[PDB]
Amino acid sequence: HHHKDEVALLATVTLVGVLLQAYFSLQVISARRAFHVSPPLTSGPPEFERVFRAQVNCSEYFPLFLATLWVAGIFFHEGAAALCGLFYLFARLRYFQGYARSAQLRLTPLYASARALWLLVAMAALGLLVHFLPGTLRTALFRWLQM
């Protein structure tokens, strides 16, 4: 009895996310030398700081992204969840690249990343509603019945 098929896209986007994230980490450790900010200092020129911060922000949002990706993907629709997952990751790639150049050039891909993410949350929320709402409405309609 196999359950890999219903989940392979979610897992593949998850892996994209892992790679994207590793990339950022490596872009940080390359800016590190080039500034020449030394560990454990994480402050330097305003450019290295911009890069460091992009990485931190992504790395903060990454578990929220994974969490909802799996919940939307399991309770709503795998391919739809996988789809926002890609837009999101893509938006976060543009985000990291804008930021590195300019603080202002980070915002369009941030705005794009925020949309994709909030979409994932709604789908997750809707999928949980479906699962939970009927059984509970069914039982609500038992208290008032009684005839």
Residues that bind a second copy (CB under 8 A): 1, 3-4, 7-8, 11-12, 14-15, 17-19, 21-22, 25, 39-40, 42, 46, 49-50, 52-53, 59-64, 66-68, 70-71, 74-75, 103, 121, 124-125, 128, 131-132
DSSP for 22-54 reads HHHHHHHHHHHHTS---TT----SHHHHHHHHH
What residue has token string 């897992």? Answer: 11
Shortest distance (Å) from residue 103 CB to ligand PLM: 30
Using alpha carbons only, how large is the chain's radius of gyration in Å?
20
Binds 17, which of a second copy, ligand PLM, none (CB < 5 to 8 A, cut-off by type)?
a second copy
Is 143 considered catalytic here? no
Give the integer Cα–Cα distance in Å for 90 and 88: 5
Is 106 considered catalytic here? yes
Q: Does 134 bind ligand PLM (CB under 6 A)?
A: yes
Give the integer Cα–Cα distance in Å for 44 and 145: 70
Q: Does 11 bind ligand PLM (CB under 6 A)?
A: no
Feature table: binding site: 32, 53-57, 60-61, 95-99
